[PDB]
Design an enzyme around this catalytic site. Structure first.
Site, short mmCIF file in Angstrom:
data_model
loop_
_atom_site.label_atom_id
_atom_site.label_comp_id
_atom_site.label_asym_id
_atom_site.label_seq_id
_atom_site.Cartn_x
_atom_site.Cartn_y
_atom_site.Cartn_z
N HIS A 143 15.35 11.26 8.01
CA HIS A 143 15.17 11.86 6.66
C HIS A 143 15.41 13.02 6.57
O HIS A 143 15.63 13.84 7.29
CB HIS A 143 13.62 11.43 6.27
CG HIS A 143 12.80 12.30 7.00
ND1 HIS A 143 12.38 11.71 8.33
CD2 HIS A 143 12.36 13.46 6.90
CE1 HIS A 143 11.72 12.76 9.10
NE2 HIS A 143 11.72 13.83 8.23
N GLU A 164 12.49 23.27 6.11
CA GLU A 164 11.20 23.47 6.50
C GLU A 164 11.21 24.63 7.59
O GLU A 164 10.72 25.49 7.35
CB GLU A 164 10.74 22.24 7.20
CG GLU A 164 10.41 21.12 6.05
CD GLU A 164 9.49 19.84 6.39
OE1 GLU A 164 9.90 19.43 7.57
OE2 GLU A 164 8.71 19.59 5.73
N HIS A 166 16.21 15.44 9.70
CA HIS A 166 15.51 15.23 10.89
C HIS A 166 15.65 13.79 11.14
O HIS A 166 15.38 12.74 10.72
CB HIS A 166 14.05 15.11 10.50
CG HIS A 166 13.31 16.81 10.11
ND1 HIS A 166 12.39 16.95 9.49
CD2 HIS A 166 13.82 17.56 10.37
CE1 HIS A 166 12.15 18.23 9.22
NE2 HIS A 166 13.21 18.74 10.06
N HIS A 219 7.65 10.11 -0.55
CA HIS A 219 7.65 11.74 0.12
C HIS A 219 9.24 11.79 0.15
O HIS A 219 9.68 13.11 -0.21
CB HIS A 219 7.00 11.63 1.10
CG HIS A 219 5.53 11.29 0.95
ND1 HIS A 219 4.58 11.88 0.29
CD2 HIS A 219 4.80 10.01 1.52
CE1 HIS A 219 3.39 11.25 0.29
NE2 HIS A 219 3.42 10.17 0.90
N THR A 233 5.70 17.40 10.44
CA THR A 233 5.63 18.40 9.46
C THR A 233 5.05 17.44 8.12
O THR A 233 4.99 18.14 6.95
CB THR A 233 7.06 18.90 9.00
OG1 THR A 233 7.70 17.85 8.35
CG2 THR A 233 7.54 19.52 10.27
N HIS A 283 14.24 16.81 3.97
CA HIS A 283 13.54 17.87 3.09
C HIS A 283 14.59 18.47 2.48
O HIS A 283 15.38 19.01 2.94
CB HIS A 283 12.52 18.55 4.06
CG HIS A 283 11.80 17.78 4.98
ND1 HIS A 283 10.32 17.20 4.66
CD2 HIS A 283 12.08 17.26 6.24
CE1 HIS A 283 10.11 16.65 5.79
NE2 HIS A 283 11.02 16.49 6.76
C1 LIG Z 1 6.84 7.31 7.31
O1 LIG Z 1 8.58 7.45 7.95
C2 LIG Z 1 8.32 8.48 8.82
C3 LIG Z 1 8.17 9.83 8.35
C4 LIG Z 1 8.21 10.98 8.98
C5 LIG Z 1 8.85 10.90 10.21
C6 LIG Z 1 8.85 9.75 11.02
C7 LIG Z 1 8.66 8.39 10.07
O2 LIG Z 1 8.91 7.10 10.64
C8 LIG Z 1 8.99 7.14 11.88
C9 LIG Z 1 8.76 12.26 11.02
C10 LIG Z 1 7.66 12.17 12.11
N1 LIG Z 1 8.78 13.30 10.17
S1 LIG Z 1 9.08 14.91 10.72
N2 LIG Z 1 8.98 15.57 9.28
O3 LIG Z 1 10.18 14.75 11.49
O4 LIG Z 1 7.90 15.44 11.35
C11 LIG Z 1 7.43 13.17 9.21
C12 LIG Z 1 7.71 12.18 8.10
ZN LIG Z 2 11.07 15.73 8.36
#
Ligand SMILES: COc1cc2c(cc1OC)[C@H](C)N(S(N)(=O)=O)CC2
Ligand SMILES: [Zn+2]
Ligand SMILES: COc1cc2c(cc1OC)[C@@H](C)N(S(N)(=O)=O)CC2
EC number: 4.2.1.1
Length: 258
Positions: A92, A104, A117, A62, A196, A94
């Site tokens: 991470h 986002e 984020h 993703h 998200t 987007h």
């Molecule tokens: C799979 O690893 C993670 C993925 C995601 C998050 C945290 C993770 O590990 C802690 C946070 C919650 N994001 S988001 N976009 O900030 O809401 C969604 C994607």
């Molecule tokens: Zn995110």
């Protein structure tokens, strides 16, 4: 098969497996800068990343996640709208297929090229999996990226991406300092929202910085060379891994600045 960002498994489909997708506090949202109200009750925001210990970078099919050792009280976010201490677990991004989309959150309907984020969990709940079951479990610090000058503190991330091209690949990623990803100003908007991505849990205090960071076209082009697919599968470029703005419903966005 499972959720993603395509025509047949993208955001508009997620509600069938994750009905909270149509909930009362979903993220992201559009930040209408004229309607957001300055809040004098907000305490100053404290980003304390000096002892952050990165471990690994993972392509999860993703996005890519830079993971931190969160077993000790090291890299923490406090203050602002937050009560207590939130520990950094990962960051991470987007991003888009083109520079005109990818974020986002939007600002007066403006889409940025990307959004960072930095994910933190409330230490009162002991660990991340317990924290996501609570309305004040997480704090996500969101930072917009625009294309212009290179961000030198991002280059170490960009240069490891070739080693995690496909879903399931990880690489050692120690000694990365996330302070190099921050803009000058900590002015922010804040509102209660959700993850998200599935499972879309309504457990996040969102803190979205007003000032974007600038990254170069070359940096973001490297993000777009990642793959959603696994090794030996047909190539699906990892682009447009953003959920669009969701209804604000019964929420107010607060500003930390006048
Ligand atoms: C799979 O690893 C993670 C993925 C995601 C998050 C945290 C993770 O590990 C802690 C946070 C919650 N994001 S988001 N976009 O900030 O809401 C969604 C994607
Ligand atoms: Zn995110
Ligand atoms: C073929 O197998 C598929 C399985 C699923 C989806 C799409 C598929 O092909 C299109 C999407 C729509 N859902 S979800 N989580 O609601 O996005 C997950 C299950």
């Amino acid at each position: 098969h499972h959720w993603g960002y395509g025509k047949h498994n993208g955001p508009e489909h997620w509600h069938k497996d994750f009905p909270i997708a149509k909930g009362e506090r979903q993220s992201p949202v559009d930040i209408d800068t004229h309607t957001a109200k300055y809040d004098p009750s907000l305490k100053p925001l404290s980003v304390s990343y000096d002892q952050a210990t990165s471990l690994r970078i993972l392509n999860n099919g993703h996005a890519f996640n830079v993971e931190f050792d969160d077993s000790q009280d090291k890299a923490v976010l406090k203050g602002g709208p937050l009560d207590g201490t939130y520990r950094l677990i990962q960051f991470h991004f987007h991003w888009g297929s083109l520079d005109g989309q990818g974020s986002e959150h939007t600002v007066d309907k403006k889409k940025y090229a990307a959004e960072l984020h930095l994910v933190h969990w409330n230490t009162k709940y002991g660990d991340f999996g317990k924290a996501v079951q609570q309305p004040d479990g997480l704090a996500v610090l969101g930072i917009f990226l625009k294309v212009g000058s290179a961000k030198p503190g991002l280059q170490k991330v960009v240069d490891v991406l070739d080693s995690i091209k496909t879903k399931g690949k990880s690489a050692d990623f120690t000694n990365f300092d996330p302070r190099g990803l921050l803009p000058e100003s900590l002015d922010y908007w804040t509102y209660p929202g959700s993850l998200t991505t599935p499972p879309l849990l309504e457990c996040v205090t969102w803190i979205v910085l007003k000032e974007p960071i600038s990254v170069s076209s070359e940096q973001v082009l490297k993000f777009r060379k990642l793959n959603f697919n696994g090794e030996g599968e047909p190539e699906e470029l990892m682009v447009d891994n953003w959920r669009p703005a969701q209804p604000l419903k019964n929420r107010q966005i607060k500003a930390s600045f006048k």
